[PDB]
Amino acid sequence: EVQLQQSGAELVKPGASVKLSCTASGFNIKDTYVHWVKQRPEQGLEWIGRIDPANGYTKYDPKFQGKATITADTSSNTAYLQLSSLTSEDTAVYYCVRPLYDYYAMDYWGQGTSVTVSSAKTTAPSVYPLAPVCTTGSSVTLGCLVKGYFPEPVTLTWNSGSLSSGVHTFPAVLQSDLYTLSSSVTVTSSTWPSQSITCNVAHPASSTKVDKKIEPRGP
Amino acid sequence: XRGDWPC
Amino acid sequence: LNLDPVQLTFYAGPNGSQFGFSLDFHKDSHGRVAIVVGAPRTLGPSQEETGGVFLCPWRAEGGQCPSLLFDLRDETRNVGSQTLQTFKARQGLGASVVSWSDVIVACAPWQHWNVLEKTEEAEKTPVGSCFLAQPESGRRAEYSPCRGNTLSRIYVENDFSWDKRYCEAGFSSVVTQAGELVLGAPGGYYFLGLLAQAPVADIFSSYRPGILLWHVSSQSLSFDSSNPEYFDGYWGYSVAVGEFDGDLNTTEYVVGAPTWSWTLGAVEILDSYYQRLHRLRGEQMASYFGHSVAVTDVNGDGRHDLLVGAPLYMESRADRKLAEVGRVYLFLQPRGPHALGAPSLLLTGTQLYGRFGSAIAPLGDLDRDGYNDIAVAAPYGGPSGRGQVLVFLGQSEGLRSRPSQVLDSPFPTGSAFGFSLRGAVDIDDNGYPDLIVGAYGANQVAVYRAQP
Amino acid sequence: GPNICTTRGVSSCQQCLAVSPMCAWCSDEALPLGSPRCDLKENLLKDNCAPESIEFPVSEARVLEDRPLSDKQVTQVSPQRIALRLRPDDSKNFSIQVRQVEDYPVDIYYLMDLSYSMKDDLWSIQNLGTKLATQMRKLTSNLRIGFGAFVDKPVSPYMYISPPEALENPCYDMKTTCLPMFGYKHVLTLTDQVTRFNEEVKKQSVSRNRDAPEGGFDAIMQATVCDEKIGWRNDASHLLVFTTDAKTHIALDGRLAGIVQPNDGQCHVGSDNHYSASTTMDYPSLGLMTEKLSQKNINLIFAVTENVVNLYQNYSELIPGTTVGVLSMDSSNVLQLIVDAYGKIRSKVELEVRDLPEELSLSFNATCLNNEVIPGLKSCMGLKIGDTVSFSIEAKVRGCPQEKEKSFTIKPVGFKDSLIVQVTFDCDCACQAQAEPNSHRCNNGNGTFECGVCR
Amino acid sequence: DILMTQSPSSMSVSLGDTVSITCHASQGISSNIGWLQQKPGKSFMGLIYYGTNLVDGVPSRFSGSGSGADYSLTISSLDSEDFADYYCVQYAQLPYTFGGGTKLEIKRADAAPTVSIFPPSSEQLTSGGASVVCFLNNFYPKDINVKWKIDGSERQNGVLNSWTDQDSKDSTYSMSSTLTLTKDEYERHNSYTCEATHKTSTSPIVKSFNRNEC
Ligand SMILES: *[C@@H]1O[C@H](CO)[C@@H](O[C@@H]2O[C@H](CO)[C@@H](O[C@@H]3O[C@H](CO[C@H]4O[C@H](CO[C@H]5O[C@H](CO)[C@@H](O)[C@H](O)[C@@H]5O)[C@@H](O)[C@H](O[C@H]5O[C@H](CO)[C@@H](O)[C@H](O)[C@@H]5O)[C@@H]4O)[C@@H](O)[C@H](O[C@H]4O[C@H](CO)[C@@H](O)[C@H](O)[C@@H]4O)[C@@H]3O)[C@H](O)[C@H]2NC(C)=O)[C@H](O)[C@H]1NC(C)=O
Ligand SMILES: *[C@@H]1O[C@H](CO)[C@@H](O[C@@H]2O[C@H](CO)[C@@H](O[C@@H]3O[C@H](CO[C@H]4O[C@H](CO)[C@@H](O)[C@H](O)[C@@H]4O)[C@@H](O)[C@H](O[C@H]4O[C@H](CO)[C@@H](O)[C@H](O)[C@@H]4O)[C@@H]3O)[C@H](O)[C@H]2NC(C)=O)[C@H](O)[C@H]1NC(C)=O
Ligand SMILES: *[C@@H]1O[C@H](CO)[C@@H](O)[C@H](O)[C@H]1NC(C)=O
Ligand SMILES: *[C@@H]1O[C@H](CO)[C@@H](O)[C@H](O)[C@H]1NC(C)=O
Ligand SMILES: *[C@@H]1O[C@H](CO)[C@@H](O)[C@H](O)[C@H]1NC(C)=O
Ligand SMILES: [Ca+2]
Ligand SMILES: [Ca+2]
Ligand SMILES: [Ca+2]
Ligand SMILES: [Ca+2]
Ligand SMILES: [Ca+2]
Ligand SMILES: [Ca+2]
Ligand SMILES: [Mg+2]
User: Where does Ca(2+) 1 bind (chain C)?
Assistant: First the structure.
């Protein structure tokens, strides 16, 4: 079974360099061309270049000439991508690719490696409970706001995972080098506030685990 | 050399 | 001793087509034996020489055979900012033909190939190619392991290392019983020579039309060398498989390098990793020792014996005079982990320029006495020079010096009667193995049947 | 008892000479009636016949032209002219010397490897060719010399077949120019015009092909079998000098170019001086080469560079008679092989007679280099330049012919020199000139009175 | 470079449908085209190589077609697994170039959002910040516009928006919109408003609160 096994997520500083790896499994890296591809949400997929590990000869898109250096080592069945002079634009997911049969094709892909270029320090999230405003309807929505943390990820759950249904946890968004994330949960008006609903945020990077009970707003 | 050329 | 020379069967191809340059027995899934014939100068549909292959069904009367169709159109692919080109003109399709199970492999050793990139090129050179066909389904695949996309310059810059541009893959060929196709490419590595191996199943499953450069992950190629002894040695001019290490799990390859070490010639026995197990050196320069190789057990001890042919060997005669007659060398395999020693027997032709040992065919047990037998070709032998095939029965002592039977060419001068040979197969189903002899000069094949 | 002179009619001085060479005639008028006029010279002197009256012609051979044998016009036969004077039934002997002065005829055909690997060896083969021409001319004035060139069979994969420009200029992808590839090209037929040969040799430039082993054996075969084209002389020593710096293609190599037809050993050159079977016929085998070299009587010399000497030394042992010499900046090695060959040449002097009259017949005694007179022999063998043999010829006339003056030629086979022997037949007596028509003493209507006798 | 234009960018389709995704090259590329699939939150998998050839293991329901500069991927009878992103890539010339992509989305009935406005928590206000959060939940189709007003005036800066992918249960979309301003300015105004505009209504859904009103 052909399988390309890439190195883990990188969190790197602007100006520095990073070197991603891609190791063959169930085949030898010199068997074909090995390519590197860049992916970003807005800009989509960009081809960085290729190497023929049998002899080291390479090809690059002029856009990545000088920044990207592809290399390979048959002794360890691994290909590499090195990105120097890291900028914000280099924040992307990076894939290595090779063909099945056709020399020039792009058929087998690695699981991808996430590279994040940032100047930010590690910062624990501020967690805030969001309760409704001033009688009620039939259903009620509660919220939980998680602000000013770095880096990703956080793991937010409701009642320690006891309340999974009727939940909407939104993907994190960046502002001024720190991430913000929110999450809503909806239940019946008979459920809350009669029964207790707590927000559970965890941020491994800062070693923080925080619980916030949603309380109704008083006079 | 191997081919037709000087050594 | 018992091949019937009276009751012959003649199959014929078109004029100038060299019908019978190569041949083999082919057996369909039902068990019905046919004869596949290569005809490397057959005209294509546009009156240009491409070569062709014919699949003959067994008939007592013989006659004309149906053509086994292959794609004879050239191909161009503009991919990866390059231009890939195939050239099938004068490719010699059918210069070799081998059958395995329900698959026929017919090769065109001189199929040319080029790659263009702007003002540069790889050079238009004979990489060779083989066409694989499965008649009972219609499936077609190809295998062309020496094609590259490296430009002329880079070879110069690397002192012509790993240069596969002139391979002529399929110049010789054999299939193992497991289904590994082995091809001789005597032009490989700048005329040093190479072997290319790949499972037949994997060749079929990785091939699609129009791709031209594709990967066969299971394939194994031999190696390039800077050893002057191997230069211009044509390693892979002939090829064969057998059992020479005593381990039935592994397969051993026999390779002929007839101009090895400054035209001394050599035959090598290798493992499936292309590690040398033994080397047999030629006796006399320019004799083309390694032109032919045959593997079979002739002394009935269960161990395969080796037969090498040197068809230009000059024998000593009265008053220091040499006479080109040809020679075949028999090497019996000893027991245990022991090397192949000197020749147990030397068979030498009698007719001048006869090219004795130009082809050596294992016949199986022809007379059904327990010992396997062989046939040796002298394509310009006999008093007339028309050609001659000689049968030699096996015995405990190895082989007999005196032939049990001599078949004389029924075709006219120039036929090359005996240039191709095949046996060890019962075509008429009478319990005795038969022999097919090609005469490419005459555009015909002759079948001889073994009688009680 | 009596002799043949007295007892055979003999009515006259002339009839007397016709009987036998030993007879003499007495004209002395003082001789008595009893004494016979036709007798032996011993008998006549014993019968008071005056010595001045005796007629007794003796046969002689005078040397007319007697120029000496030459050293180092050219005189090889000596003497050149002799005058024989014979009487009825008589014979006479004379001498002749023959010497081999002229140089031995030698043919040297030069095969030039003009492939790309010879780019650096070009000066050397040019130097070798011109030294062979010049120095062997000093050795023999009857030298003839010619040359041709070879590369290899102009077919893929030997030939570069891309891009299209590469066919006219094989050196195209090196951004330089060389000549188109060719199999074998005959350039200059065996000539004695040495200056011209040298000039043509110096004009030669290299071409290019792909593989190290070249097609020089095609050239060797065609240079052997193409009699008319190369112009080998019949009575002449034949040397084929072959140059190269690499391996050579041999029979069964041609299958890599799709060529499977065996070499037929026939000449295929003709009008355009190219080997026309180059692309359709395989390289020759060592045996076929040996057969034709032997048949056409040609000695092959491998003039190869040091890196392949051993290879060609080994081929040399499989083609008996072949020798090997080292091609290099210095030409001494190869020249020596030719000088050595010339040293081994030997010749013969075989006398033949032309325009011998019916009445004459000759016999010979040969004195050869063994200094022994082998009688009834007219030829010597095993001569080098400067050697001299010698014959002794005897000529007998049958009776007296009325032709009276004839000439024949003793000539050695192959020599332009000869001996003209002018033969005269002296059948009369000096006293016959004084005929005196008036009878005087006969007076019966007889007429004439010569040497003291009537009719 | 060769521009690969892929169409459409997204389609709303159902199970059992047969769809096609077209891809146009800026010049002829002789079938030298590949088709890729990327399932939500997963990596890439090759589908077709050289125009029409399926990669080993790819289901028969996928097929490629086209020539010259115009090519198409066709899924016949959609599986639940086929709702993903799909891309074309050419390799006629270096540099290799990709299409923009096509997103297969689950089709369903239109649904209005449930808007819920939330004033800043006491914790945040004591820390000196003020964020007003608004959830627009379980709507279809995915296109929605949110507008913030403070005392009637439209507020543009300091808004951060986030959208979930299509829900696994009810195939709907949700959006969150957070308005952050200084606590100082927050306490200088009474009315805060969150207006949702969505195709399910010509007039917008408005949720509001007046600061300190309980
Ligand atoms: C080629 O070379 C040969 C060899 O030199 C040479 O041969 C001579 O030929 C002439 C003819 O022109 C011969 O002349 C005749 O001789 C007759 C008698 O000869 C006898 O005596 C010879 C001398 O004997 C003494 O000396 C020798 C050694 O010096 C010694 O051995 C003796 O014991 C003895 O002491 C003797 O050599 C000769 O022997 C040869 O002949 C016999 C006969 O068959 C043979 O058996 C021997 O083995 C040996 O070869 C012999 O014993 C003589 O009678 C004769 O005269 C008659 O004829 C002439 C006319 O023809 C009349 O005018 C006359 O009246 C007589 O009737 C004549 O004189 C000469 O003897 C030969 N010499 C030899 C050695 O053979 C040729 O001339 C050469 N040819 C050319 C073209 O150059
Ligand atoms: C032209 O032809 C010549 C003569 O045939 C070739 O030279 C011979 O090359 C062979 C190689 O096949 C040499 O054979 C070797 O001999 C060695 C012992 O020989 C000794 O004695 C000779 C006296 O004749 C000396 O000249 C020599 O220097 C030695 O002292 C062995 O040790 C070798 O054995 C090894 O190889 C063989 C395989 O052949 C193995 O079986 C052995 O186990 C071992 O590994 C070998 O047998 C021979 O010495 C050479 N002869 C001469 C006279 O020099 C040229 O090669 C050939 N040239 C070209 C260009 O074609
Ligand atoms: C082949 O050509 C020959 C003439 O050389 C002719 O006799 C024969 O008919 C041709 N073969 C066929 C099958 O027509
Ligand atoms: C030989 O044995 C080895 C055991 O390591 C096995 O892997 C291999 O498949 C065997 N060879 C064949 C031809 O089955
Ligand atoms: C010829 O032979 C005779 C034999 O008596 C000899 O005397 C004479 O000298 C010879 N003559 C010549 C010209 O050699
Ligand atoms: Ca050289
Ligand atoms: Ca084995
Ligand atoms: Ca055996
Ligand atoms: Ca038997
Ligand atoms: Ca039978
Ligand atoms: Ca060559
Ligand atoms: Mg050369």
Answer: 243, 245, 247, 250, 252
Close Cβ partners of C265 (under 8 Å, ≥ 6 residues apart)? C257, C258, C259, C281, C282, C285, C287, C288, C289, C290, C310
**D406 Cβ partners below 8 Å, 6+ apart?**
D357, D360, D423
Tell me whether strands C444-448 and C434-439 are parallel, antiparallel or unpaired: antiparallel
Annotated binding-site residue? C367:
yes
Alpha-carbon distance C208 to E67, whole Å? 17
Query: Which residue of chain C is at minimal alpha-carbon distance from B3?
Result: C190
Q: Give yes or no for a contact between D42 and D24, defined as CB atoms under 8 angstroms apart.
A: no
In one-letter notation, the amino acid at residue E128 is: G
Residue-range domain boundaries for chain E: 1-107, 108-211
* Contact (Cβ atoms closer than 8 angstroms) between residue D209 and residue D241: no
By C-alpha distance, the chain D residue nearest C257 is D253
Distance of CA D49 to the CA centre of its chain: 58
What six digits make up the tokens of D346? 């030997």
Domain boundaries, chain A: 1-119, 120-214
CATH number of D58-100+346-455: 2.60.40.1510
Cβ of C249 less than 6 Å from ligand 4: yes
Closest CA–CA distance from residue E91 to any residue of chain C (Å): 6
> Is D211 flagged in the annotation as binding?
yes
Query: Could you tell me which CATH number the domain at E108-211 has?
Result: 2.60.40.10
Is C224 annotated for ligand binding? no
Q: Rounded to a whole number, what is the distance in Å from the CA of C324 to chain D's nearest CA? A: 6
- Which residues of chain C lie closer than 8 angstroms to B3, CB-CB? 160, 190
Token pair in block for residue C436: 């097919």
Q: Which helix (H) or strand (E) holds D143?
A: strand D143-150
Superfamily of domain E1-107: Immunoglobulins (2.60.40.10)
Q: Which CATH class is domain D101-345?
A: alpha beta
Smallest-distance ligand from the CA of C414 = 3
Q: What ranges do the domains of chain D cover? A: 1-57, 58-100+346-455, 101-345
d(CA C183, CA C240): 10
DSSP tally for chain C: helices H, then strands E: 4, 36
Token pair belonging to C302: 């269960």
Structure tokens at D397: 């006339």
Interface residue of A27, A102, A107, A108 to substitute, partner C, most C CBs within 10 Å: A102
CB–CB contact B3 D307 (8 Å): no
| E92/C208 CB distance under 8 A | no
Whether E1-107 shares its CATH topology with E108-211 is answered yes
Nearest-by-CA chain B residue for C161: B2
Stated in angstroms to one decimal place, the resolution of this structure is: 2.9
Q: How many CB atoms lie within 10 A of CB C337?
A: 7
CATH topology of domain A120-214: Immunoglobulin-like (2.60.40)
**DSSP states along D33-60:** SSS-SEEEHHHHHHTT--GGGEE----E
Tell me the fold of C1-452.
Answer: Methylamine Dehydrogenase; Chain H (2.130.10)
Backbone angles phi, psi at C267, to 5 degrees: -125, 135
Q: What is the distance between the alpha carbons of residues C84 and D452, in angstroms, rounded to a whole number?
A: 124
Could you please state the CATH topology (level 3) that the domain comprising D1-57 is classified under. Answer: ligand-binding face of the semaphorins, domain 2 (3.30.1680)
Backbone angles phi, psi at A75, to 5 degrees: -60, -30
- Chain C, 171-190: which have a CB under 8 Å from a chain B CB? 190
What CATH number belongs to A1-119? 2.60.40.10
- List chains touching E (3+ CB pairs under 8 A): A, C
Helices D122-139 and D194-203: crossing angle in degrees, nearest 10, is 170
Within 10 angstroms of residue A18's Cβ, the number of other Cβ atoms is 20
Confirm or deny that C429 is annotated as ligand binding.
Answer: no
C159 to chain B, any CB pair closer than 8 A? The answer is yes
Residues A126, E135: C-beta atoms closer than 8 Å: no
Q: How far is the CA of C242 from the centre of ligand 8 (A)?
A: 11
Ligand 2 touching residue D314 (CB < 6 A): yes
Report the alpha-carbon distance of residue D405 to residue D407 in Å, rounded: 7
